[PDB]
Design a protein around this ligand. Structure first.
Ligand SMILES: [Mg+2]
Ligand SMILES: [Mg+2]
Length: 260
């Protein structure tokens, strides 16, 4: 194994404590010293990655896959970025508008929210301490080149709009919102973009995840690891199920594979 891909929330950072376990930091320091490249693979836009300062201050991250693979970069170099078909951006906007539900629209250098409600303030601010996202109208947000949109819709509502965003990927790990990206843009695409830059082969990758939006990279990586507390469809997509995050699941999996 030469490249490791880690989802953030529920894989590196505990939803319960909001911290990265000490054994995870120790395991990544050991893998780093042995030459393994360590990559983040998150549905979060770079703008709101505010919980990795411990890995970042240790300079342990070699590259970032953000917005579920639609925005990837290594250092200061953007190696891959896509945008959602404008008509599908308009369709989702129209849908959220009709339904009276919030929706975040993320651009390369801007992030906005349309019709924010308590679910938005609670989840992103009170819970994840994310910076207040500026409010804008559905009309304005959907006139920009959007890399990822995050409608706060349930799985049932989702079924309602699928028909109007026919080529988009939808990744969901929570019942209250999903991340929508262009055709083919999932963490699996992010792995491919990243490894090409380092001359690393797919058979030399390992991914770690706990959510629905991790299923494609768990299947795609040579070895996929699901966190012990992930739902069963996430575990079924993996080659190995490790312990829950707060039971040293990352360090245990890495030890089990002989990486450290
Ligand atoms: Mg997660
Ligand atoms: Mg696999």
């Amino acid at each position: 194994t030469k490249a490791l891909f880690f989802d953030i929330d529920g894989t590196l950072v505990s939803f319960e404590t909001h911290r990265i376990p000490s054994s995870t930091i120790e395991a990544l320091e050991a893998a780093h010293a042995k030459g393994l490249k360590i990559f983040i693979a998150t549905g979060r836009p770079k703008a709101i990655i505010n919980n990795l300062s411990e890995l970042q201050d240790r300079n342990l991250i070699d590259g970032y896959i953000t917005m579920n693979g639609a925005y990837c970069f290594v250092g200061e170099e953007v190696i891959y970025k896509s945008a959602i078909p404008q008509e599908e951006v308009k369709a989702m906007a129209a849908f959220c508008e009709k339904k009276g539900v919030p929706c975040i629209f993320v651009e390369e250098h801007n992030i906005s929210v349309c019709q924010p409600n308590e679910m938005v303030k609670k989840i992103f601010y009170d819970f994840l301490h994310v910076n207040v996202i500026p409010t804008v109208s559905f009309e304005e947000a959907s006139n920009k080149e959007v890399i990822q949109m995050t409608p706060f819709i349930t799985e049932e509502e989702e079924k309602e709009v699928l028909p109007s965003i026919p080529t988009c990927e939808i990744g969901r790990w929570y019942p209250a919102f999903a991340d929508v990206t262009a055709k083919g843009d999932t963490k699996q695409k992010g792995i491919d973009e990243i490894i090409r830059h380092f001359g690393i082969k797919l058979e030399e990758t390992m991914s770690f995840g706990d959510g629905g939006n991790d299923i494609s990279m768990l299947r795609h990586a040579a070895i996929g690891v699901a966190m012990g507390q992930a739902k069963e469809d996430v575990k079924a997509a993996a080659d190995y199920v490790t312990a829950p995050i707060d039971e040293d699941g990352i360090s245990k999996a890495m030890k089990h594979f002989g990486i450290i």
